[PDB]
Amino acid sequence: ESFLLSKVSFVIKKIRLEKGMTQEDLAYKSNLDRTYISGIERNSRNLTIKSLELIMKGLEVSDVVFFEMLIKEILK
Amino acid sequence: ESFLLSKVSFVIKKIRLEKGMTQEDLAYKSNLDRTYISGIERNSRNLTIKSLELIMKGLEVSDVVFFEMLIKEILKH
Amino acid sequence: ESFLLSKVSFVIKKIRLEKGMTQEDLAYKSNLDRTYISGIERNSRNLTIKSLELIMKGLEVSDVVFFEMLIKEILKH
Amino acid sequence: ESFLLSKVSFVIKKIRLEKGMTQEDLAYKSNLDRTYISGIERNSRNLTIKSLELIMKGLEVSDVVFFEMLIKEILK
DNA sequence: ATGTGACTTATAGTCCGTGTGATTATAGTCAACAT
DNA sequence: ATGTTGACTATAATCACACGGACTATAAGTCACAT
């Protein structure tokens, strides 16, 4: 697997939780598949930017906040 | 098309020129086709995080540094 | 345009495919531009004996056997 | 300089002589410059196929006969 | 609720080639004077 | 006759790039069945 990919996924999971969402609800909100999301969170998926963008919409988080977070997460 | 993509697209080119690289050099070190590097910069193609990671390694730049410039380009007017 | 040129350009391609090479290998091995190899085959282009020699070295072929295949191509109907 | 380019030039000179032609006449017959011809024969020019072709027409020699000769000259 | 697996279908990514403006090196062509 | 030296100017040859079609790998999106 990839280092970045795991932290993207970790971040996605982090934010979903800090907000109190279920996967079911992140899937609904972003108009994507729930198993799709589960896959990403166990990090069994290699998103495209577009997909990442949809997940950010679903999380209701701007690109900037996401990347600010991803950076922090990246530095152990 | 996509907001984030053209930003990612823009930043890949910006860095590449800042480092005096050519598409040929880049696609070189990213072990992607020079067609793909062109494709990305040209028509903001929808790359995968893994591919983006390869390009970062190609640009001889870190995850962090890239995303910090990404944030800057998004914030601009 | 020129009789001999399209014969030369035909034979460069023939050999290139016979040896299972691609254009951009040959462009490397011949120590000429990517687009020049294309341009020679694609249209014809008016190359120099020195450049022709480089290509022959690149096709991994001798002056002699090149010209022998050149003669054969000229002689065709 | 180049081996091939030398043998080419030598051949051009050879054929010119076996036909009893002067350079002046070889240049008239192919409409090129006499100093141009001179230059090739003293191996100071790297001609293009197009030019080579004009010289063959000026020598009144077919492409095939030229290369047949060029091959033989190439083999010592 | 979340996590599998496995199975299509869209598309990301590859591979080989075409065609092009802009710049640099050099062949094409023609002087003057040689011998 | 041929040789040589500068020249000017056409174009060979370079360099960075765009663009397309066809093919291969894989992400996108949806089932069934776990827990």
Author numbering:
A (entry chain A), D (entry chain D): 2 to 77
B (entry chain B), C (entry chain C): 2 to 78
What text appears in the publication on this structure?
The C-protein C.Esp1396I is a member of a large class of helix-turn-helix proteins that act as transcriptional regulators of gene expression in both prokaryotic and eukaryotic systems. C.Esp1396I finely regulates a bacterial restriction-modification system, providing a delay in endonuclease expression via a concentration-dependent ‘on’ and ‘off’ switch. The C-protein–DNA operator complex consists of two ‘controller’ C-protein dimers (chains A and B, chains C and D) bound to a 35 bp DNA operator sequence (chains E and F). The dsDNA is distorted in the complex, due to binding of protein dimers to each operator site, resulting in minor groove compression (leading to a 50° bend at each binding site) and large major groove expansion at the DNA sequence centre.
To investigate the distribution of specific damage throughout the C.Esp1396I protein–DNA structure with respect to increasing radiation dose, eight successive datasets on the same C.Esp1396I crystal were collected, each exposing the same 100° wedge of the crystal to X-ray radiation. For the later datasets (2 to 8), molecular replacement was performed with PHASER using the refined first dataset final model as the search model. The later datasets were refined only using isotropic B-factor refinement in phenix.refine and were similarly refined to 2.8 Å. For example, by observing the step increases in damage frequency with increasing dose for each residue type, there is a clear difference in the peak detection rate between glutamate and aspartate decarboxylation for doses in the range 6.2 MGy to 35.7 MGy. Clear loss of electron density localized around the carboxyl groups, due to decarboxylation, is shown for Asp64 and Glu54, and the rate of carboxyl electron density loss with dose appears marginally greater for Glu54 than for Asp64. Figs. 5(a)–5(f) also show specific damage to Met57, where electron density loss and side chain disorder can be observed localized on the methylthio group over increasing doses.
